[PDB]
Design a protein around this nucleic acid. Structure first.
Lengths: 192, 260, 180
RNA sequence: AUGGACCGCCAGUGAUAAGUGGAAUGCCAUGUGGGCUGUCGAGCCCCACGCACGUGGGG
């Protein structure tokens, strides 16, 4: 993978955030499996002005119109088990259930979000997830370009001893939780 | 058919006309005294300029030759209003002394002390042309046509020659508005019956005030008058004065075209 | 020769000076004389015409008229009236010069500065730019084949309407006099 | 076409020379910003799976 610090300017909506992330990468690929996760990822870091954002990626980004005045960028290749390292992350805990008139949506509170998350990591890296328990988007009018929704993210943080390296790294590259294209998924680690 | 033309031409520090004394001529109008450039002085310069560029249409457009004996047409049909300032103007004294070149065992016993008056302001000029009688008297509509066009250009281009070497008052009007009227000629002089206040200039404000007076008079008496105006300012629209034109000679051309 | 006035409004600045007595007084030391002289500063607009037909008519020959015109224009740029210059040292070169060679009639740009400039900032750039806009608007309103040309100290603006730019005042004077 | 019609007040000009506003000067003496406090289930669509409880993919 490879990491960059980038910052869009004029961002009014989340979908245009997605599009500004894909229009700077020409050769794009998508390798999918029926039920498993798709194989960029990204995290919103400062949103009231322009919008600074950390991107994880496979294909190299170069500045575009109204981009940075420079191409930071580093290419990284990943992490010994038993050792603790800093984590991080935004995701959307949900419960899907039959809806009157299907619906994404202990169990809310800060304890089934912790249950949900450590479910997400599973045998990979053991961690503690900052529990949130509370973003809107609409289509920019372009045909076949989504529509309008709501949503709710949660950020999580600390050091996460990993129990399987290739598989937590697998999780780092695949992403944790739905809506990866709308801010979620990216797990960030650092040595303790 | 009456072609009349209004100009808002400003003049820097100058003394174009003066009294039997040195001070310039003034109307007391709207309660506020205001310097003026008398009609005959201005007319003389325009007539001299027309006759110079044109190489008896001068006895027709202008009533008669001053140095020729009357040829039964003393009336000139053309009417020249006396130019007067948009605002009230106080007479500005300029004290001056001519220097004696030969020096005595004395310094500065200057050759001649005196003081002459000058003034500056934005004069609101205006004129009229009785087109029909000009055609009936001149005969050919074409000579009349060339003469009318050249008379308007002379009205615009010229400035009187008076104390001009001491004050280069040569200037072009900021606004001209030629209105081919069939009912009767009308001067927008009452637009300035209330002299404008100062410190921000007067060209722009006098331009829209004259625009307000043209809207109101056009409102009370809607007419078939063909109108148009050219300005040195593109910042403000004056829809009541008619269609705007890119320049003065283009304007004069369109209104000479409109009379016939 | 027009009266050079300021582009901007100027209040008369008063300076209070006291000529000092030199021998010390035994008891009361005071000024020998004390008064207040008025001074002022600003960016003047200057204008002048030369009627070539009359100057050629006066000198008779066109060659002495040519030297007289070039010499006049150079004097117009170089000279300063010298009024209390020993106490103020007001010697200065004009910030901008614009020679036009017109055939129909001379036109002063004094109406361009009838609306006084507000202030707080340097009037030179705004005065040059305003004279530029008025020269542009007059060339559009009153079309003419007059040979124009200018020379300026500031390089912050191109001033397109003032004609062909020349690097120096003598080059400009020589070009426009040679053009007439 | 009006005691009117036609009709320039106008040619020229340095306001000049000379000039310290100068000497002296603490805004000083006094002061808590204090008490209170774990950050721990609707969400619009497409598709794949499902033990139709629910999982996951993408927008």
């Amino acid at each position: 993978t490879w990491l960059t610090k980038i910052v869009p300017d004029l961002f009014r909506t989340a979908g245009n955030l997605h599009r500004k992330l894909i229009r700077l990468s020409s050769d794009l690929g998508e390798e999918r499996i029926a039920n498993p996760r798709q194989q960029l990822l990204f995290r919103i870091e400062e949103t009231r002005n322009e919008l600074y954002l950390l991107v994880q990626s496979h294909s190299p980004l170069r500045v575009d119109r109204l981009g940075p005045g420079y191409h930071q960028m580093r290419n990284l290749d990943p992490l010994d088990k038993g050792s603790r390292v800093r984590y991080r992350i935004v995701a959307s805990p949900t419960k899907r259930l039959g809806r009157s008139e299907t619906q994404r949506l202990t169990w809310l509170r800060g304890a089934a979000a912790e249950e949900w998350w450590h479910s997400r990591a599973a045998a990979n890296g053991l961690e503690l997830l900052s529990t949130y328990a509370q973003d809107d988007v609409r289509d920019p009018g372009t045909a076949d370009r989504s529509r309008k929704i709501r949503h709710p993210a949660v950020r999580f943080d600390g050091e996460a001893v990993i129990s399987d390296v290739d598989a937590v790294r697998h999780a780092v590259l695949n992403g944790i939780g739905r809506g990866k294209s709308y801010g979620c998924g990216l797990l960030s680690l650092a040595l303790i | 058919t009456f072609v009349d033309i209004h100009a808002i031409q400003t003049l820097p520090y100058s003394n174009i006309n003066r009294d039997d004394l040195g001070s310039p001529k003034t109307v007391v109008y709207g309660g506020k005294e205001r310097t003026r450039v008398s009609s005959q002085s201005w007319k003389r310069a325009v007539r001299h300029e027309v006759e110079a560029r044109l190489g008896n249409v001068s006895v027709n457009l202008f009533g008669r030759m001053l140095a020729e004996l009357p040829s039964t047409e003393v009336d000139g049909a053309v009417q020249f209003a006396h130019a007067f300032t948009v605002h009230g103007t106080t007479v500005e004294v300029d004290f001056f002394t001519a220097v004696d070149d030969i020096p005595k065992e004395n310094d500065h016993g200057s050759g001649h002390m005196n003081a002459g008056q000058f003034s500056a302001g934005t004069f609101y000029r205006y004129a009229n042309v009785n087109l029909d009688r000009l055609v009936e008297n001149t005969g050919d509509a074409q000579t009349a046509r060339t003469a009318v066009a050249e008379f308007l250009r002379a009205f615009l281009s010229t400035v009187p020659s008076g104390k001009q070497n001491a004050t280069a008052a040569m200037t072009l009007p900021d606004l001209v508005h030629i209105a081919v009227r069939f009912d009767r000629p009308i001067s927008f002089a009452p637009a300035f019956e209330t002299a404008l206040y100062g410190s921000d200039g007067y060209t722009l404000r006098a331009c829209q005030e004259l625009n307000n007076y043209a809207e109101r008079l056009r409102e009370v008496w809607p007419d078939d008058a063909i109108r148009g105006y050219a300005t040195v300012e593109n910042k403000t629209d004056l829809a009541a004065l008619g269609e705007r034109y890119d320049s003065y000679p283009a304007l004069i051309d369109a209104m000479v075209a409109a009379a016939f």
